[PDB]
Write a protein that binds this ligand. Structure first.
Ligand SMILES: CCN(CC)c1ccc2c(c1)Oc1cc(N(CC)CC)ccc1C2c1ccccc1C(=O)OCCOCCOCCn1cc(CO[C@H]2O[C@H](CO)[C@@H](O)[C@H](O)[C@H]2O)nn1
Ligand SMILES: CCN(CC)c1ccc2c(c1)Oc1cc(N(CC)CC)ccc1C2c1ccccc1C(=O)OCCOCCOCCn1cc(CO[C@H]2O[C@H](CO)[C@@H](O)[C@H](O)[C@H]2O)nn1
Ligand SMILES: [Ca+2]
Ligand SMILES: [Ca+2]
Ligand SMILES: [Ca+2]
Ligand SMILES: [Mn+2]
Ligand SMILES: [Mn+2]
Lengths: 223, 220
């Protein structure tokens, strides 16, 4: 199986697999069952921003999600990436839908990593119809209104999964990275599902079979 | 396979499986490859003390090892016990030797856990038939607990593994705990002593002498 470190923006509580009873953001280390979560007052139809940061000095992964004019949701956790991830990885964005659904629209994505010094930076503020520096998996598509649609849209569809990975491998392991993305999750359902994640993976990571819904396109099961 | 959280006092560097290049203390969460380590200035033949603490407020596992009039060695790490361990556990001490060897002698051992429901035990002496301990492998009692095999002349043996678990199951989440032990390692020494928390049915995995400390079935 693939090795995954991720930050999830989990819009749909699946309390049967350990997710708190409310929308939450969490840090996922080799399992969909987050090591730590924070309540997320998710806003249907508004543009939100997510910011992820890591350094090898304190070796803590930290994330914050926000909308303009509202309090943000943060979470942080100890993790030594040398133990969890291979030395070279692939960075990406993942999303899914299940029974319930929502748009998983990405309007912008930036990433910076330094390994001290060698560095990689990319910034997307728009996405073209053939964005050759992204590897699109599953249902993900680019270029409709200049955005990245991680899951299928006609209006959002159910039982969809998709992801977009930066084309180049990244040398992940002082060592550090940051990622930022903007997203629009809209849904006609009064329950949106399921969510978006920023992830870091083995270079040859692919969508696990049966990873729609509560598995976010990241994991082959809920273990 | 068992589920293990442990504090290791690692006397022998196995750099081929990620242990730093010096004796160290480490926090192990479901792998012998420590999540975090600190350098440990181990003192051959001198009684040492280890203290381990955990609370569900900050959900951090901490540990300190020291000797009289020396600097201590300390390590801490975020651990959410609910998503690592089963709800009921046993607690114990484990040790091993390999191609290099040491005595792994425990002179006292205490433990406290609160959830209020509470459990506490304190051993400042061990008897020959210590009915509230489960002895696994080469471990023996009777006033000390000898985790690994010591011959009749008092010299340790290689290729040995042994554990002692408290007799009752322990309710570890539904939260805090503390453990202390004192030990005497005499010998290059190998391999170390751990305090661990396990599934209730845990037993020494086959082939877990040497670097695997009696805890883990492989070095994954
Ligand atoms: C009353 C509780 N709720 C409302 C939230 C509920 C909803 C749907 C079912 C529910 C229950 O129960 C079953 C049970 C089964 N069984 C087999 C005959 C008995 C277990 C078959 C299908 C469904 C279904 C079902 C019916 C029609 C079409 C599909 C299904 C269908 O998808 O159901 C999945 C199996 O649900 C079993 C019970 O799960 C707990 C309640 N529940 C169900 C769902 C819907 O989950 C699906 O969507 C989620 C959000 O997008 C994803 O996170 C998730 O990965 C995904 O499988 N959530 N909460
Ligand atoms: C730390 C220094 N290093 C790395 C360069 C090292 C490397 C090889 C040996 C080393 C030491 O020490 C011995 C000692 C012995 N003795 C006689 C039984 C004791 C003096 C025999 C073989 C070896 C060998 C040896 C030479 C050739 C072929 C095989 C081996 C040899 O050690 O074979 C056992 C399997 O080893 C594969 C190589 O492992 C990586 C390096 N390293 C360190 C050690 C000693 O390990 C053994 O003891 C440890 C301490 O109790 C245990 O933690 C551990 O589980 C255990 O396997 N092994 N290797
Ligand atoms: Ca969920
Ligand atoms: Ca090309
Ligand atoms: Ca070792
Ligand atoms: Mn979740
Ligand atoms: Mn070690």
């Amino acid at each position: 199986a693939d090795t995954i470190v991720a930050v999830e923006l989990d819009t749909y509580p699946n309390t049967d697999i350990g997710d708190p009873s409310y929308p939450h953001i969490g840090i996922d280390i080799k399992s969909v069952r987050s090591k730590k979560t924070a309540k997320w007052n998710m806003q249907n139809g508004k543009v939100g921003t997510a910011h992820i940061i890591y350094n090898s000095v304190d070796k803590r992964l930290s994330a914050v999600v926000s909308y303009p004019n509202a309090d943000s949701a943060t979470v942080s956790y100890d993790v030594d990436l040398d133990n969890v991830l291979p030395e070279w990885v692939r960075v990406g964005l993942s999303a899914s839908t299940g029974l319930y659904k929502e748009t998983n629209t990405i309007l912008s994505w930036s990433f910076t990593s330094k390994l001290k010094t060698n560095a990689l930076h990319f910034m997307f503020n728009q996405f073209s119809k053939d964005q050759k520096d992204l590897i699109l998996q599953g249902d993900a598509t680019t270029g409709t209104d200049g955005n990245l649609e991680l899951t299928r849209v006609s209006s959002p569809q159910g039982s969809s999964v998709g992801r977009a990975l930066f084309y180049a491998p990244v040398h992940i392991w002082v060592a550090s990275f940051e990622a930022t993305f903007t997203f629009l999750i809209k849904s006609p359902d009064s329950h949106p599902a399921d969510g978006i994640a920023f992830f870091i993976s083995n270079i040859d990571s692919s969508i696990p079979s049966g990873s729609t819904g509560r598995l976010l396109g990241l994991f082959p099961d809920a273990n």
